[PDB]
Amino acid sequence: HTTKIIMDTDPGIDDAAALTMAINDPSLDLKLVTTVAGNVTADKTTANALKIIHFFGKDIPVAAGAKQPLIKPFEDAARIHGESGMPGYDFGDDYGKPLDKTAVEALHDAIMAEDEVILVPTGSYTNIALLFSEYPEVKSHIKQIVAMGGSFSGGNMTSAAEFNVFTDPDAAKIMYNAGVPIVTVGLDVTLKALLTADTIEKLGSLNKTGEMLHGLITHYGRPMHDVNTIFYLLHPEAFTTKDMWVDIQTDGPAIGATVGDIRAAYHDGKTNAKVCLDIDAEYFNKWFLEEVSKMK
Amino acid sequence: HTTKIIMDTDPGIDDAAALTMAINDPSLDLKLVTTVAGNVTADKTTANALKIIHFFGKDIPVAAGAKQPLIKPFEDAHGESGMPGYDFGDDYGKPLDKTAVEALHDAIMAEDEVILVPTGSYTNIALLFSEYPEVKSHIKQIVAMGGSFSGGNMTSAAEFNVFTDPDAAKIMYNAGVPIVTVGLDVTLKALLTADTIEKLGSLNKTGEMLHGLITHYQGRPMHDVNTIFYLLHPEAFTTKDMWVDIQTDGPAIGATVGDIRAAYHDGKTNAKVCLDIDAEYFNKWFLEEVSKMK
Amino acid sequence: HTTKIIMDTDPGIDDAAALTMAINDPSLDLKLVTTVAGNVTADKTTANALKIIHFFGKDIPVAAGAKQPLIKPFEDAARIHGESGMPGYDFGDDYGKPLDKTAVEALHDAIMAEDEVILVPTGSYTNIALLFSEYPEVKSHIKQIVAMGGSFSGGNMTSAAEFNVFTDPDAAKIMYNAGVPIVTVGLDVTLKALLTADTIEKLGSLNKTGEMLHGLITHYNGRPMHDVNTIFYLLHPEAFTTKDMWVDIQTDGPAIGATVGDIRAAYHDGKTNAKVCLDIDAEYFNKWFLEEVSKMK
Amino acid sequence: HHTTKIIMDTDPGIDDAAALTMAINDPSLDLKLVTTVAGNVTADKTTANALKIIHFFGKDIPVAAGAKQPLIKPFEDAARHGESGMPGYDFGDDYGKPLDKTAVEALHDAIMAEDEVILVPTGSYTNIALLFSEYPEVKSHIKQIVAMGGSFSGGNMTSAAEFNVFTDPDAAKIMYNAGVPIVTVGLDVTLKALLTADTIEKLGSLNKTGEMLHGLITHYNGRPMHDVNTIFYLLHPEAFTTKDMWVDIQTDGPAIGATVGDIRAAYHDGKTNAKVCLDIDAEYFNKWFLEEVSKMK
Ligand SMILES: [Ca+2]
Ligand SMILES: [Ca+2]
Ligand SMILES: [Ca+2]
Ligand SMILES: [Ca+2]
Ligand SMILES: [Ca+2]
Ligand SMILES: [Ca+2]
């Protein structure tokens, strides 16, 4: 048996590393990749997902999704224009075409086709919120959501908020209230998931995949974000977790905050997320190299 | 010329009267009816739209839409149709095998120009504009039942359709498509008189049907039908272009906040707000239109 | 045999008419007038209150209060600059001085001196919020608050909000949550309290007070009267239709300054914090206004 | 040879007791006044606790009791026994009485008496918000506010919010928008300010002050020290890493009580209102704490 997964992404170098591990691990069956707009437009994140899938010679379908957040106007200060949004390696132009259907339509069809799937959002959550609103019947087919985003110890857009949640707080609130079990892979662990200078050097000489990932990773040691959704699916024993109630702040100066009820004081003992609080960084490094060494 | 219109509804007696006028006026071509959940489930509002369309012998397609608001949990306040006072029978046909969003996307992209007429909460319109922003250049305007600039009905601050899905209303009001706001400011003045309702019941089969719905619960304020009355008789309304914001949290959740002084938005407007109505002409019009029907 | 009252004001022509009726009614004992900043700064509203009290020759102390709202920055487009903020009559320049103490300190001393008082806020509620936070012991001495402000049917700063609440929504929230009984005299009644052209003509020829009030009333220019309806409520509650309900104050977002009435009683388990004024006998308001001013200087 | 004039607003509290100990006894500091606010115990009990500490050192530095409740946010009753709120030592019953005036009134008089003072709030900020609203004239007399509270890396009431800000977010917003320079002594540094087992053992054997502080510090089973870091900042700012930034207070929603730092300087046109403490020399904090207490009774 393989675990059926669907990835919703805004590649993005971090998403490229997540997709690399998901595509190549033989215990995972990646059914579908959807994209959302982020630091580049949905047209560019779509092209980037196609570039990674084509690099591995796979025919995994890509569906382009939401061009904008539900409500929060996208910060143009965060919008890179006339660039790829996934720099540091030449993929060529031979990478194929997305589906004609939207990410929401593709998610609905791919989820309803499976008894059980794990959904893995590594961008802002706009497509997931739209999916759950238009097709709430998908939820019984989803075992778990393993989401990159949030922080319980300090943000990156402000002190209070992490990028994926901050980009579409309203979509994050819909996802966090949907009643599907969530694993929160936030900055609490991703800032600890330090790919060492020694690991990054070894990566660049390993094979064509290692050369590609080295190019993306070194373009700007490196904390790895989105790839920890896949590392959690394969090695949950590498993480320390805590079940808690998570609320999304959707306005005011703390817009985009993932607020954890760390005391369990306010929600009558109810939880909606398994929050990732720590990671084995040594095993993450060993794992990352072991996995890439088996690829092209 | 005929105006192409698409109606998004939660029938509902008020939506029944709106659909009746839209179906039967020869200057309007109703391409599609979509439904949303409200006082009753999306399954029941879908059945109610199909009952009205079938009553006039039309095969106007119905697509069932959103079962719940985007964010705000629906206030539960069993057994009921949600459109009582007339027996439509069995045999009213079936919805499309796609969502309201998918049906709206296909029907709007097939036309150069359409008018969109939401008479429920705005969930399907917000989902449509988020998933398919390419529809917006095909929409001349939105003529929306909802809001109030002079006192609400769910609270003092908020009208039902906006209150039910404030987040969807915000998405619709920020989408850049021209809006006409048909709020409580005019619908509470659109009083169908006791004399009108009596004449309606004896007029014909449509009059009998509308009489049955209208009198199920002296005179009745009519809501959603004023979107169609606006399309056909804009001269019967007093309007003011203004900036409208949607309050989406706090005690004033669901408020349509009009910048009545134009103090806060650098003179920009996103809505033509209906502030008054010729109630006498509304009554005369309502009877004249129904007299031409079955 | 007199009702002890304290007025917190931002005069303002409407507050001048309220103070006029309160000073001159023999069933009322106006112990103190406090001021808050509004369309003009607190120094100007203080001067305006002193002008009205000095016009009637009374001993009534004035204490200057808050210069700014608690939290919401005062909208500069609503600030009237290099002006009195009470135009249409020259009182001269011999109107006396405020107390040395703040409005809050003067309110605390005047309320604690009475077993029972009625508080009558006709500006924004900044002083009352500060008072209840610093000296919650005053609340057992207050029989009720009769407040000018709010709307349950359309605002004047936006469609959602009335000026006095809009000006300091956080102060209004503190006041509305304080557990002192409130009567809300909002735009629902004040926009119906239309002083007719016939009344305003008769007012100007009545006596010195009528001449002074005519000067203030007709400076911009029939006229809706606001703040004076707090005093008309105290003297003639039979002139009003009221409804006890739960009122929340919106303190942020586009509906900032909204008084939200739970008109269905759906959300508060049947609890009430305000008696909301919904209708007024405008004919009696006119008759009363003329009858009262005819008994003055 | 010259002293810094300071005023402390406190809710003692073991952490405030340690802050007051250092402030009372440092020869470069002149503590003019202590005010109190309600927190984990009532304002009556925090007042008693400040008087106990002052009396322990043979001083009669005045204490003025302040606000009994937050401005707006109902006090979380799960966060309020027949308990002192400062256990682990018998201070006896000879500790004297607070001033008759409120904290606000005492703060206004003490600040206006000085050309320059530093204000040091170690509780929730209710008294400071009321002070700045009623007496904005104090602000030109205040060089700086050195505040215990906030976090830019994880809270203690929720993931988003620290206790002092969470307790009265509205008061914290008024303080952060008042235009007086702020030094933020948040959980970023106070959770690193670990008084070691070795330090706490040496403290207990040092003298009567060390015995008293040992009693309070070891009552609940090193120890992170909070409020005392305001005084450690005043004396040894070189022991801290700071960054000027714009700080907003979240006053509603699930992130209520958050101190939101514009860490990118993306949203406020490069304007700052706070010098945020991000790191501390914990080794020097320990050395300093022992050196200071060794010079006391
Ligand atoms: Ca990403
Ligand atoms: Ca769709
Ligand atoms: Ca409807
Ligand atoms: Ca005071
Ligand atoms: Ca006034
Ligand atoms: Ca403290």
Numbering used by the authors:
A (entry chain B): 7 to 226, 233 to 308
B (entry chain D): 7 to 83, 87 to 226, 232 to 308
C (entry chain C): 7 to 227, 233 to 308
D (entry chain A): 6 to 85, 87 to 227, 233 to 308
Paper passage:
The crystal structure of LreRihC was determined at a 1.9 Å resolution. There were four almost identical protein subunits (RMSD between subunits do not exceed 0.13 Å) in the asymmetric unit of the crystal, which belongs to the P21 space group. Contact analysis revealed that the protein is a tetramer in a crystal, which is in accordance with solution studies. The LreRihC subunit maintains the typical α/β fold consisting of 11–stranded β–sheet surrounded by α–helices. The active site of LreRihC is formed by the residues D16, D20, D21, N45, T128, N162, E168, N170, H237 and D238. Each active site contains one Ca2+ ion, which is coordinated by carboxylates of three conserved aspartates (D16, D21, and D238), T128 backbone oxygen and three water molecules. The analysis showed the similar environment of the cavity for ribose moiety binding formed by D21 (D14 in BanRihC), T128 (T125), N162 (N160), E168 (E171), N170 (N173) and D238 (D247). It is noteworthy that the side chains of D20 and N45 in LreRihC are oriented away from the substrate-binding cavity, in contrast to holo BanRihC, where the side chains of corresponding D13 and D38 might participate in substrate coordination (orange dotted lines). In the case of LreRihC, H237 (H241 in CfaRihC) has a similar orientation; however, H86 and Y226 (H82 and Y229 in CfaRihC) are located on flexible regions 3 and 2, respectively, and thus are far away from the active site, similar to the apo CfaRihC structure. Based on structural comparison, we could speculate that these loops as well as residues D20 and N45 in LreRihC, might change their conformation upon substrate binding, as seen in known holo structures. Region 2 (residues 226–234) is unstructured in LreRihC and BanRihC, in contrast to other RihCs, where this region is an α-helix.
